[PDB]
Amino acid sequence: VPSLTQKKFLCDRTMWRIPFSSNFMSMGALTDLGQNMLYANSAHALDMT
Amino acid sequence: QAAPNRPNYIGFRDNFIGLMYYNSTGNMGVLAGQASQLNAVVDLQDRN
Amino acid sequence: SKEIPTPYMWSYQPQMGLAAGASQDYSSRMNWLSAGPHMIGRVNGIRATRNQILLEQAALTSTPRSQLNPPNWPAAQVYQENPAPTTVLLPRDAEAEVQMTNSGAQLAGRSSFTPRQAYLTLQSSSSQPRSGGIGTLQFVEEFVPSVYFNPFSGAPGLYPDDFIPNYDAVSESVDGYD
């Protein structure tokens, strides 16, 4: 029978992570980006969809 | 025709995730010195 | 009223370069009600050191102005882009080409016909420098966290009135239609 594939992925028992580091990499507990003045010495609103 | 009931293993809950009413501003704990109106646990209502 | 006050952070609008709104430090603050007068005497003082740091880094980084969030930064205090004179090496001798093409039959599918070649160094920056609005790398330089060493203690007039987000400094009025 002519067939079309179907793909799905499971990541159960885990939580998606998007680290604040500029390179997305664990360079330390205190992220570099989350410590620059721009996000530290200036309030910022945030919107996510 | 009969069959067999399913199987529910009701049991206590892993790590006791519950018996202790953990983070909840309405029912908090205390670890303060006896002679001190203070506390040592504030437990805001967002922490798992 | 108070005195070691908790600095008023400045918000940004990635839109028009001028800043937007302002508010006391909404989040970053300790919770000392579980403390006694041995570290509630040190949190008070760590915050004072924070205030002094903010003052110094404000008077050392900012460019002294007369209105907290100016409605239109003048064209001399906004970081301008000064690129380098672009130099194009004009890749041919126009006279030489035109001459030979007219002469002989060269249809010409450095140069061999003539060893002449000249750059055309141009100007690269702009005609009229930018005027209104500063970039992010200037926001974190101009609007350092502002410390308000006393609350709204005065007549309506004297009151940092560039803090309320809904201010139209052009007309000294709160906008509407909301």
Q: Are C145 and C24 in contact (CB under 8 A)?
A: no
Q: What is the 3-state secondary structure (H, E, C) of chain C?
A: CCCCCCCEEEECCCCCCCCEEEEECCCCCCCCCCCCCCCCCCHHHHHHHHHHHHHHHHHHHCCCCCCCCCCCCCCCCCCCCCCCCCCCEECCCHHHHHHHHHCCCCCCCCCCCCCCCEECCCCCCCCCCCCCCCCHHHHHHHCCCECCCCCCCCCCCCCCCCCCCCEECCCCEECCCC
Q: Are C4 and C11 in contact (CB under 8 A)?
A: no
CA separation for the pair C68, C76 (Å, rounded): 17
Token pair 């055309």 is at which residue? C120
CA separation for the pair C99, C108 (Å, rounded): 12
CA nearest to C13, candidates C131, C169, C129, C165: C165
CA separation for the pair C118, C100 (Å, rounded): 19
Per-residue CA distances from A25 to A11, A19, A32, A37, C156 (Å): 20, 7, 10, 20, 50
Instruction: Tally C-beta pairs within 8 A across B and C.
Output: 12
Q: Distance from CA of residue C169 to its chain's centroid?
A: 18
Q: For residue C97, give the H/E element and its range.
A: helix C94-102
For residue C17, the chain A residues in CB contact (below 8 A) are none
Q: Which residues, in sequence order, are CB contacts of C71 under 8 Å at separation 6+?
A: C18, C169, C170
Q: Which residues, in sequence order, are CB contacts of C84 under 8 Å at separation 6+?
A: C124
CA separation for the pair C132, C62 (Å, rounded): 17
CA nearest to C2, candidates C147, C146, C143: C147
Long-range contacts of C26-32 (CB under 8 A, 24+ apart): C26/A43, C31/B42
Q: Which residues, in sequence order, are CB contacts of C13 under 8 Å at separation 6+?
A: C19, C20
CA separation for the pair C74, C51 (Å, rounded): 29
Residue C146 DSSP one-character state: B
For residue C30, the chain B residues in CB contact (below 8 A) are none
Question: Which chains would you list as touching A if contact means 3+ CB atom pairs under 8 Å?
Answer: C
Where are chain C's structural domains? 1-178
- What is the experimental resolution, given in Å to one decimal place? 3.8
Q: Closest-CA residue in chain C for A38?
A: C140
Residue A37 to residue C26, Cβ atoms within 8 A = no
Q: Which residues, in sequence order, are CB contacts of C153 under 8 Å at separation 6+?
A: C1
Q: Distance from CA of residue C67 to its chain's centroid?
A: 15
